[PDB]
């Protein structure tokens, strides 16, 4: 069948941004709850 050509590649930028956001979220995740791990910066 025929669908959109999708000549451009916005997927690369979108996936890079998603990866960065997920990395930040994973870094912040371990601090959830009263027993959350402390972070040193």
């Amino acid at each position: 069948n025929a669908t959109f050509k999708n000549k451009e590649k916005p997927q690369e930028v979108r996936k890079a941004n998603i990866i960065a956001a997920r990395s930040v979220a994973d870094a912040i995740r371990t601090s959830l709850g009263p027993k959350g791990m402390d972070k040193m910066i």
Partner: protein
């Protein structure tokens, strides 16, 4: 129906992140905690 069902299923699966993180930070077995919570929710709604 359509992509809506799949995306809703993915959203529901992602919603379980919070209890998983709480179990991991508390030193409890994630699988055990989530299974027990789901089993207890057959009678309770939010108190468990």
């Amino acid at each position: 129906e359509g992509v809506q069902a799949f995306i809703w299923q993915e959203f529901a699966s992602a919603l379980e992140v919070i209890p998983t993180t709480l179990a991991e930070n508390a030193g409890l077995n994630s699988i055990k905690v989530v299974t027990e919570l789901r089993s207890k929710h057959e009678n309770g709604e939010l108190n468990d």
